[PDB]
Structure formats: structure tokens, C-alpha cells
Symmetry: D2
Subunit: 452 residues, 4 copies
């Protein structure tokens, strides 16, 4: 089976707008087959553990509307998954698609030698969009690249000052590339890949005393902390909100020891929590801010690491100290610029507050009626989670919701949690449908427990 042949077959497919029954039967077969053979058979077994019958093999085909996805069988799903935080402004958002299309006609990828205007524009726009002294931007292609950039900026800055240790928090997720993975907290994701970067240590999230104890003990032993890295709200941890004033406290702790504050808003950024950045809630200015996911408007891959001139200036004397081939390419920038405009124009941060208040109320309500299955519902803005009592119940919830054509999924660090992360553009009727389908799934699950 020649490689030309495979590529020609794929090009032929990419060009099909719609599939009929026999085309769908064949594409679904090839995709399951090739997943087993060339991608990961484990992912097939995973889908089985959160669906019922043939739903494991559901193959994603196209955007339906701003907030829906369609599989190869025409089945349309309401998206409460959001690509795990990617689709803040909806699927194929017309303003974003348009911007990308326009730039695609001029030049999608830059030479990396001439001065590329959209890099300059997005960095200007980001400077203005961010708190206080956050002034300089480095663009890359993902969240983990955003965090590697942050760790490196911290390292270049703190190294000549004698500081090499990094503090993160348990529950934290910061990416799976090996530097970012040193900060990431989940044991099962870390252990096979040890030894990781030396001098990374963890303290309980939300616990200012434990953090202070770590910075102070490190000082005593001559292992002074370079930087503290944390999410404002833990995402893959299961949507964990810290106590009030904790972020402000972590900011003061860091100034006190002369440590840098790195804030990872790859997941909480771009309006999802009810404000453009989750740090704007306590009005805290980190030294380095990590952005990705939704920054590309659900159309492009992109990441950005924004810092103070003070810190970022370590990159000035030699601008090749940290580089990236694709980072800040014109297509990625056009997507990011469109997304920032859409967010502001349509006041989507404010909408996420409003829609999130509604949905979490409906979720807390269902939690009360079904403590039979549901432990608790947490959230802020359109970042929410339902924590069930067992692992198996949460898997059954995902399964039942799937049958009702609502797409949800779990959390990387938390086995008992299903997330709810819809596009911020989710319509008021669609929020009603989601609570509706949530109830029905809970009811069906209850009935299954009595059934078994």
C-alpha cells in the first residue's frame, strides 16, 4: 500500500464536503483500523470506557454551528468539552476563520528573518491586554512550549543571582514536555520519565503556609527558589479554586523572597473564567504569564509567554538564546488577533460569568437531588466540573451524556471528575438543554444502580 496512494486517498477525502452511508461505513472502518495500527490502540480502549456500544468509534467530521460538532454519521453534539479549553469563541468562528483565510492568501508562514508585522501587532495588542508591567511577548505553538519558555526566562534571570529551585503545586498540570513536566504534578505522568529537571518541588495548592515553608527552608539550605509556578485555578486537577486572596498572597510571598511568579493561564486564560485573565479577579500581576489553547481562536495552534521588561530583557543581548521555528507565524497571529477582538467586541468574558453562574446553579441543584451519584459541583465562569462519588459513575455520566449528543470528558489529574467547558458562545437555550441532558443522565444512572 504505497505512500503516494495513501496521501492521494487522504487528499480525496479532505475534499469531500459530505459523506453518504457507504462512504461513512468505510471511513469509520479505516480510522478505527489505523488507530489500532498506527496511532494508539489504547485510545480505542479508552473511548470504550466512557461510551456505550458503537459510540466508542465515533469519528469527528466537522463543525455544525458555533457550539456544535458533527460526526461522520451526521449526528450533532452540543459541545460541553470545548476541546479541553480551546474553543472559547466557538467552532469555526466567522471573524477568526476570516482573519486566517485573509492571511493565508498573503503568507501563512514567515521566513523568520525579515520583520514580520503580525508578530509585532499581536505583541503590541498583548502588552495592552495584560496587567501592569507585562510588556514583552514570546510566541510558540502550545501550552507546554509556553511553560518551557517561562521556565527558561526564569532560569536565565535567576541563574546569575544564585537561584535554581522551582516551586510548583500538587494537582498542577503545566504540559508534558520534559521541562514543563518537571512542574506538572501527576505521579503517573512523571515517574516513567525520571530523572526530570533537578530542583523542582511541590507544595499543596491553596496553602500559603506550606509554600512559605518551602521558600524559607530552601533559603536556609542554600537552595533558594528561583520561581513559583501555578495555575490560578487548577484545570486537570478537577477545577480546584484556591481560597480568596491566595493569589495575592503568593504574589507577596514571591516579592518577599525575590522569587519570580509564573502564572499558567493556558486553561483559565482568554476570558473563560469570567474575566480575560483569571489573575484579574484578585488583580494580581505575575512576572511571567503563560497563554495558549483558546488564544488561537479554535482555529490555529499558538502559545504566548508574556513577561515584564525586567525579566524578558535576558533575551535582548542574544535574541537567539531562545527561539522557535514556527512560533508567531502569521496565520497563528491572525487567529490570535481575531480572537482577542471577538472576545472584547462581543463582551464574551462577561457572558462566561453569566452563563457559568446559570450552569453551575443548575449543576449544584442536580448535585442536591442526586447525592446518590454526585459528590459536588465546582466552577468559575465557564470553567466547571461535576465531581462524582466513584470513578465508574463519572464514566457512566460521560457515557449517558454522549448518548444524548452532549459532549463532555474527564480531567487528567482527577479520576472522579467530569469537566464542563463549553464555548463561551453557548446559547441560553443550549445551557438549558445541557442541564436538561445532565438531569436525564443522572436519572438513567440512578436507574442503572437499582438495575444492578
Amino acid at each position: 500500500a504505497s505512500a503516494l496512494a495513501c496521501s492521494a486517498h487522504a487528499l480525496n477525502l479532505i475534499e469531500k464536503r459530505t459523506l453518504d452511508h457507504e462512504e461513512m461505513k468505510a471511513l469509520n472502518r479505516e480510522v478505527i483500523e489505523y488507530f489500532k495500527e498506527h496511532v494508539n490502540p489504547g485510545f480505542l480502549e479508552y473511548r470504550k470506557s466512557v461510551t456505550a456500544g458503537g459510540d466508542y468509534g465515533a469519528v469527528e467530521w466537522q463543525a455544525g454551528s458555533l457550539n456544535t460538532l458533527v460526526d461522520t454519521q451526521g449526528q450533532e453534539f452540543i459541545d460541553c468539552l470545548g476541546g479541553f479549553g480551546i474553543f472559547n469563541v466557538g467552532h469555526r468562528n466567522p471573524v477568526v476563520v476570516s482573519a486566517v483565510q485573509n492571511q493565508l492568501a498573503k503568507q501563512p508562514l514567515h521566513s523568520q528573518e525579515l520583520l514580520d508585522p503580525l508578530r509585532a501587532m499581536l505583541a503590541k495588542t498583548l502588552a495592552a491586554l495584560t496587567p501592569g508591567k507585562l510588556k514583552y511577548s514570546f510566541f510558540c505553538n502550545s501550552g507546554t512550549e509556553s511553560v518551557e519558555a517561562a521556565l527558561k526566562l526564569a532560569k536565565a534571570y535567576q541563574s546569575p543571582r544564585g537561584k535554581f529551585t522551582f516551586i510548583a503545586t500538587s494537582g498542577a498540570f503545566h504540559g508534558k514536555s520534559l521541562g514543563a513536566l518537571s512542574a506538572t504534578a501527576k505521579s503517573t505522568f512523571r515517574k516513567p520519565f525520571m530523572p526530570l529537571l533537578p530542583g523542582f518541588r511541590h507544595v499543596p495548592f491553596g496553602n500559603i503556609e506550606a509554600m512559605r515553608t518551602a521558600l524559607n527552608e530552601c533559603k536556609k539550605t542554600g537552595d533558594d527558589v528561583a520561581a513559583v509556578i501555578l495555575e490560578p485555578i487548577q484545570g486537570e486537577g478537577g477545577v480546584i479554586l484556591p481560597p480568596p486572596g491566595y493569589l495575592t498572597a503568593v504574589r507577596k510571598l514571591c516579592d518577599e523572597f525575590g522569587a519570580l511568579m509564573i502564572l499558567d493561564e493556558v486553561q483559565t486564560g482568554m476570558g473563560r473564567t469570567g474575566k480575560m485573565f483569571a489573575c484579574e479577579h484578585e488583580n494580581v500581576q505575575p512576572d511571567i504569564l503563560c497563554l495558549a489553547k483558546a488564544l488561537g481562536g479554535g482555529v490555529m495552534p499558538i502559545g504566548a509567554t508574556i513577561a515584564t521588561e525586567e525579566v524578558f530583557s535576558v533575551l535582548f543581548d542574544n535574541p537567539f538564546l531562545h527561539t522557535t521555528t514556527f512560533g508567531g507565524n502569521p496565520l497563528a497571529c491572525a487567529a490570535a488577533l481575531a480572537t482577542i477582538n471577538v472576545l472584547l467586541e462581543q463582551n464574551l468574558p462577561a457572558q462566561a460569568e453569566q452563563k457559568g453562574d446559570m450552569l453551575l446553579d443548575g449543576f449544584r441543584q442536580l448535585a442536591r437531588e442526586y447525592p446518590d451519584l454526585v459528590q459536588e459541583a465546582r466552577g468559575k465562569g465557564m470553567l466547571m466540573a461535576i465531581e462524582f462519588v466513584d470513578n465508574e459513575i463519572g464514566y457512566n455520566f460521560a457515557s449517558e451524556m454522549f448518548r444524548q449528543r452532549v459532549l463532555v470528558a474527564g480531567t487528567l489529574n482527577n479520576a472522579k471528575t467530569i469537566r464542563i467547558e463549553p464555548p463561551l458562545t453557548l446559547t441560553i437555550e443550549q445551557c438549558e438543554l445541557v442541564i436538561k441532558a445532565a438531569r436525564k443522565a443522572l436519572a438513567a444512572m440512578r436507574v442503572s444502580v437499582e438495575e444492578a
Copy 2:
């Protein structure tokens, strides 16, 4: 000055424009320079200065002109002998890659990552078919440095249960800038500010099987057994360093003998550039893990791919979330890659890279004979070439004199005396000639400038 809203709307409107007033052009250029200084990196403005003449430093990128040319905001058109450091193998805005991407953008650009996505499966089947021997499984990411992190993690996951933790790379090597990849990357400049890096990384001189065998033997004796060796078939940012014929095969045998894994970083050498689809096909070395990026995205999308045997990729099956990526293998990028593979094969671009590379290098080596004055030597394999000069400053002047002639070149990350020549594989034969003529005129100018300077 403005709010983010006003800034985004200004950029959004500039994005829609196709051409520029003279006063619109002048305005934009002053913006780009100003914001590069205030919000990107003023040091980059300075680097552009040291490799240009006059306000050349502030040439601002506006659009692709043809397959092999770029146009700035002033309508100046440049023959691209930089190729985005190995990105534009099939040219700028190649119609088959643009079309595939545009068609997928109409369906779905990014996936949920939850449902099975069809193009991931197709690109994975296609790469299986494209790759030598037992390379069977593909992990998709967003960059070359991400590609190499995936390689290292795969090796780590496989070798740490077998009690092996040491990674051997080579000096001169460039494997990426993220902290995992940076640990294998070898340039002192790039490494020291971020130390300590990953433990267990050791380096031997490139292209020296004698030294590499000693390394692995010593590591075995002391109980610090070698998990994997990582190398580029040809060192790119190192200054286009060709290993002696026999090297890669010897590396394969050695890895076989000690039970080390062999990682080939073909992020720059891959997708046709050296005269084959992959530079390892030259000696027919099958690696345990193959890294791709740069040109795999067709010059339209960012993509990286890590391909490995089922034996090694295995480690990811029981828990498929052991290594993941949010954007990796998205439909837009998969389309761009499948398009690219098709074009490379249809238009037989690897074969073309061999013909055009022979001519171009033959041309440069002749010029080197003529100016021992300024040039040390010219080297290359297919369309991956470099010209080494006597001084960094002679080199910087070549880049500058070339830029004045509207031919784009640039240097290499681990060798300052070296100017890379990395044109699209689609560079026309006439353009090949033009580039040699441009290079000749530049060298003569340089000779005169050094004359008066002494």
C-alpha cells in the same frame, strides 16, 4: 497608546488589505520596528543591522510572491535561499497545500481531541508507508523541539524499566530549545544559562564512531548504561556537517549491540531536502525513532511528528494519556502534511533536490576556488548547503551583500562563520543561475570592501 480592542482592530484590518499606500507602507514599517523594540526584542533589530546595509535591516515581511520568492511592504521581491531554515521545501503557498488546508478549514480546523479524528489516522497510515522498515506508529505534535521531547520520552519510557537512563548526543548537535531537547542540543551558549538540564546527557564528537563506542562501553562498565543515542544525519545548525559515509550504519550496529535505541532527528534533513525523502535512506539506516517537523507542514502549517517501531511506541498503549498534546495532529495540520507528502512524491521533488543541489554546490565550490580570499569551503547534500567564510564578519557581509541583491540568505545557530543555503526544492533552474550570479557579485563587492579596509 490604544486599547487592546483598537490594536486588534487595526491589525485585523491590515490583515485584510492586499497592497499598501506609500504612506500606509511607511506607517506600518515604523510600527513594526517600534513594536519589535518595545514588545518583541530590540536585540533582533540589532542582529538584522549586523547582516544588512542601511535601512535594509528593517525590511518588513508582507507576502509570498511566487513559489520561491518573498515580497516586503515596499514591493521588493526576494529569491528565497533561506527557505525558513528548512520549512518551505515545496515553496511558498504551494497550491496543493493551500487548497487542502483551505478545504479542511471549511469542515473543521481544530478537533475536540476526544472523538477519533480521521486525518490523524490517515497521516499516521501514510507516514507508516513512507518510513523505512518497522517505523509504524506516529505521535503528532506542533514543532521540532516537541517532536524530540516525544522521542526522548518514548526512549525514557522504554529504557528506564530496563535500567537504562543515559542519553548520548553529539557536539554541534541542535535538537530544539525546550528543556528536554535543550539537554541534547550541544551549543554551550544555548545551554549554560538554563542549567542544570536533564541529568544523564553526554556528548561525543559528531561522525566519530570510535568515540561513540568508547562512550557506550564506559557507561556500561560503571552501570550508567546508555538508553539511546540521538543525532542528525547531517548537522544543520552545526553548519551543515556531513558525517563520513559509513557513520550512520556504524551507529546503527553499535546501538544494536549495546541494546541502545537510535533516535534520528530529521527535523531539518527530512521531507526531501537532501535528495531522498529522508536523509537516512542514503545508507538505508532504519532508526528506532524518527523525528520530523519544519517542512512536514508544507510551508503552511506548524506540525511535528515522532515515528517509532511498535516495539518502542508500545509504552504508550496501556495508558494513552502518558504522552499527549492539545493541538498535536489537528485536522488543519494533518491536511497540510498529507498535501506535502503528495506533492513531494508527485513532482518527484527529492530527485529535483539532488539535481539542483549538485548544480548549486558545484557553483559555490567554483566561487570558493575564486575567492579563497573570503571563503573557506562550500559543502552540502542536495538542497541542504552552506558556505563557510574565513571570518564571522566576512560571512555577515555576504549575507548583507546578498540581501542588497534581493536574494535572501541567513546564518546557522552553531557556526558563526557559516551562511546556509536552503532554497525551496521548487527553485527554478533559471533562479538557480541567478543565485550563483548574485553570489559572485556579492563576493566581488566583499573583496573590494576588505581591500579598502586594509
Copy 3:
């Protein structure tokens, strides 16, 4: 002069029991010069900062009585330094010296091939002397070597169980060799020698909640703690007593997480705090116990690492995994066997309880009279300390006690603190002289303060 001439001159001096006034002048001259030129000019600077006038030049010549040292000028000192904790049964304790001579008559060092009986005899005595399941002994030559053996036993036991992290406490001193140094906590002793062993972390001494957090956080990130190591009371730290129930809580915490408990009793051991081992105040059984200093009766150098058979067994398959050339030699063992015998016959640990109480009563009294100069006095048995308001006041105390012919000295991890650490054999008569000497010292100190 040749090496031979130097060896002969020094062999001549060793045979001399007493010095002419002229021989004395010349000896004190050569000793100061050779310290400068061949030992450490800096140790001469240190002594000056804690003596007055030419007192810095004092050169030690012989034991006087049990509790007494005599310099080269015939000047005699009551020893309240105890060699920083080695002279527990006094200077040249007759039973210990006798054991050592008798063994020297037979065989001072062993072959390491044939079975050396005194090693079997010492290992038997210590198994009988240690609480609970502590059963096997590895003999070495110092405290720091004793801690190295302990880290290795934990490493060899816990590495196959997937655990590599070590928790120690700030203020801790566990030795200066590079493995022990990784657990030793003073910044100033650690920085020039970094990178030390990886995987070592520090929590505050005496704070159990912080220790639970470190064990728990390590468990969460896959960095599971192999062992916890600590002194029951911190010596060099400044005689830092933990809360009641702390040591026991650490034992239960280790049990809970399946970490090994290492107890560093190099200073506290052999009767020093009022019991044979300080771990006996709460009846705590560590998995590994480290001994040295006083174990050699103030006559020989020796160390011992005692462990449960569960832990020590990691050395049975290949008894050559950890070894030492001089460890467990006949003279070291004779000395230790004599020391154990003397401590038990004369009920010396119990004496240390009584005399420590009485001595700490004198110092607490003086800290009452002189808040002028003194922060507080503390102690457990005969391991006591006086904390002063300043470093210099403490240095002044040390100099005044010296002028008063009572030998004291400072603590490695606390600059405001003067140890009082006399032989357990100190008479009540001398206890009262020591308390008078300290009052006179404070009297002169207060005066000199109000001169300025």
C-alpha cells in the same frame, strides 16, 4: 629540613612526658608556625576571635584528671567542651585505656580476611544495647561515615521499591562528607560543593505537620521518600529540643508512608542526654541508628550504623557492597566495649540527667540575673547551650571562660550559641566551679559592655 628529620624531631617530642620552659617556648612557636604554613592559617584567626591576647596560642599537651586538659604551659582546664561530645567517660578513662593497651599487645588492626572476634563481640553488645529489632552493626571510623552507611542502607533497601527521596531538617548536622552533607542543612557548608546528592529536601525541625506535608506531596508527584533522617535533639543547631511526642510521631509517619527512619545519634548517643540513647526518652525504635563520637570512649575513633535485620539484609547477598578498610578494627572495638561497660557499671547516663539538671539550674539562674547578655539557657542531660543576645557577646563569653580556665566552644549552625558539653564524669565540685566561672565571666562581660 628532610622528612626524616621532621619525623625524628616529632618522635622525640612524643616520648617527652614534660617540657622545659625553653622547649615549651620553642614548641608553641613551631606549632603556631606549622598551623599557618601547613594546616590552616584560618584556624589561628578563629581562636583569636574567641580568646584574649596570647590565649589563642594555647597548645594542648595532655589529659590532667578525668575532666581536665593541660596545655604546654602546665595550665589546667576544666573541660566543658568534651571534644564536642566525645569525652563522655572523661579523658584517658582508665578502663578504656586499659582495654586499648591490652588489645594493642595482641593485634591493633585486623586482616579483614579472618573473622575478627571483637567485631562479633561489639556487634553483639550493641544489639543487646539497642531497643527493639535493631540487630546488625556496620562499623566505620566517624560520624559522617556512619551516616553514609545509613543513607546507603536506605538506598539499597528502597531503590528496588522505587523510592529515592530523602527528607532532613533545617538546622541539622549529619556530617561533612558529600553524602552526609546532602542531609546537613547549613547553607554555608553546602553551597560551595553543590550539586550534592539529588532528591534531598528539608522541613523545619520539630514541626510534624510540615513533615507530613513533605511525605504526602512527594507521594503525590511520584517522588516517594526513601528515608527521613534526623537528630533526636539538634546539636550543632544550638541544642534544639523538639516537642514531646514529635520523635514518636515521626516514627509513625514513617511507618505510614513506608519510609525508613534514620536516627542520627552521633552526638546525643552514649549517655549524653540522660539515657544511653536519646531515642529512649520516648522509647522510639528507628530502622537505622548512627553512632560515633563518644562510642570510642575518648580514646579511639569509631562509628557504627545499627539496623533492623529487615534493612541490613540488603548487604547479605554480597557482603562487599559496603565496606571500609579500618572499620571495626580491634582497637576501635576494645575502646567501645570498654566505654559501654563503664557507662553501664557507673550508671553514667543517669548521672548526666542529674548533673545536667543541676548545671542547667545554674545557667537558667544566670540568664535571669543577666538578660543583659543572655537570651536563654537550655539542655537535655549534659547537652546544654547558652544562647546570647549577639555573636560577639558569645565570643566574649568563650574568651572569658577560657581566661577562667574553663574550656567551652560554639556551635556550627548557631552563631549566638555556646555549647556546654562536659564529660558525664564531671564531679559535683567541678559543676559548682563551672557555674562560678560563668558568673564571673558574665560579670566581666557586663562591665566591658558599659565601658563602651
Copy 4:
């Protein structure tokens, strides 16, 4: 039996000069039982492996003459083991014994506060005994401690110069404490205790071009070599001699790269290879020289780390940066001073050369005659080794020599290799008797093999 009872019993044994037959049988029975239950049962298994019948349980009792040992049964063994390099001047050497007794009469251990004279005298004597600029001494208690001190000297010196990597050689043995173990090279000794000190790498012994490549690649990547450590002759490796001029080429390579040279003469030191130090053969001055074993005259444990003023001065500003409690105690200084005297007075390095050649000639003839059992014989001075065709043949040799009351034992990195390391004071008749015994042993071995 109680701890007190155990100590009393041991003390009576220590007093008894002779043992009758059923005193022996009781003691022997004890020694084996206590080794089993409180020391290490594996030592019994190893000793069985290199003995025959009731030979495993040889229990040693006193020195016999200068060069012999007697066990509890009255069996006298000629000592070709030398305690693995300790007994350069024999067992209970009168001059060293007398120096020790005289010092025990005054002060066996010091306060560590007053200036102890014998530390100054030994440091002066060693300065005059050592090559060139080796001037300052740090005294400790073992070989592994003097390597520890050497690594720290280099670290303190090289850390501020930006260099942190250490190069050792495969085959090497430098001690078993975790710092020294990082440079020790046998896999068996290292693996279970990893992670060790970071930044330690190994190159093949005697191959200068391999060492240049490592030093050079390290520099390229920003991981510059702080220091190189090696033995002049590898001892535990199997008595591995380097090419002539290698040692000089390492000195020059270090000069060239600005790395420190550390020479480990813990085994080769104090006369054994024909000169006082094996570096004297090629006139090499290391920056740091390590000594132990024979430095203590076969009576005391001691170690020394001697360095140039350049290097050692990193300890002047803060003389407490590296310390050890027992290091340089009067008893150990007295034993070293006497050793230096005996070695020089009795011209014993010269004797080591003569007896070395004679013994090596003898083994070389036997190798020649029994190529069925013997691979080859190597050596320099009284450091020698016989390599056999396999392990078992080597073990049979050791066992046969033991039956003939000649004591030999293996090496820790090489299992086919038997070391021959007698006192430098071995008589010429004893030299001849060892060669005859080796012959009788080999003959019995060939015959043994014949039957099978």
C-alpha cells in the same frame, strides 16, 4: 545476655593473652554465631568460597612476628594480604607501637579547640615528604574520607570558576562513601545507590586520548571539567599499570584545560610500589594527593589529603567549611610520624622494589609453567596480582594458599585476580616460601582439575 554482661565478657577476652582448647572452641563458636546474627552472614559464605573445610572459620587472635598472624587455634599465617595495603611496615611494628603507647600515655584524642601539636608536626613532615608545592594537610580517618575531602577541595576551588564536572576512570576504586563512590567505577558498587553525585563521567584507564575527548566535549557543551581523579596504579581493578608517561600526560592535560589533578595513592602510597609515592616514578605533582591505609603504620586508622596552597586556601577564610571530629587525633598523628620514620630509616621503599622484582619473577615463572590455570602476573614493587583463567581457579588458589598458611585475597573489581600485597618487611626467606607455596598450590590445582 545483657549489654553489660556482653561487654564484661568481651573485656575478659581482651585481657586473655592465650586460649586453651575449649576456650578456643567456645570463642570460635561465638564468633561464628555473632557474625551470623549481628554482623553479616554473607561473610561466612564468602569465606567458605575461598577456604577448605573448617578453614572458613579461621578466627584471628594476635600478630605473630612482623609478617605473620596467628589464629585462635595457634595456626600462624604468613601475610601476603597486608590488610589490603595497610601493613607496609608489618604487624605491631615496635617503633609505631611505641609511638602510640607514648601518646596514649598523654592524650589519645584532642579537644579540637586548642592547637594539637602532632597535627602541626605531621602536616610539616608530610609537606617535606611530598613533591613540589604540596604544602597543606587535612587529616581524616579513612581512604574514602580523604577522597571526600579531595573532591570538596576541588569543588570549592572550581565552583566559583564555573566548573562542576568530574572525570574518573573505569576500573577505578576511590572509596565507598557516596561522594567517593561517584568516582569509584564498579557497576556492582554503584547501581543500587544511584542517583550519585551528578556530573561524574568515566574514561578508560591509561588512554590519554580518550581523556582528551571527554574533557574537550565537556567544554564544548558548557559542562567544563573541574577535576580528574585517578590512581597511579589501579588496585582493586586488578593491579592495572598505565603506560609509561600516562601519569605525566594527565598532569599536562589538566594544566592545558585548567582542571585540577587529584591522585589517589591511598593504596600505592607510603612506599608500596618502590618509591614513597607512585607519582615519584615519573616526577608528577598532583594538585591534590590522597593518602590512607599504610599511613597509619598498621596500628591506627588515618587518612590525609595534601594540596597546593593554591587549592587548599579555599579553606582559610572559613576554617569550619570542612571538618571531621576525629581527624588528626594525637594517636593517629603519632602512628603516621613513626611510619614515615621507619620507612625512611629502614630504606623500605627500596626493599619494596627488590622484594617486588623477586616475588614477581617467581610468579611469572609459575604463570609460564601453569598456563592451564594462570593468565598472567603483574605488579610494581610490593603491589602485585595473579590473574587466573576463571573465578573458581582463583578461589581455589586462595583456598590452597590458606591451607598452607599463606594469606592472600581477591580484589573488589576483578574476580579472577588474586592480590599479593605483603608487608614491605617480609623476609627474603619468606619471599622464597611464598613462591614455593604458590607452586605447591598450583600443582594441587592441576591435579584437582585432572580428576574432574
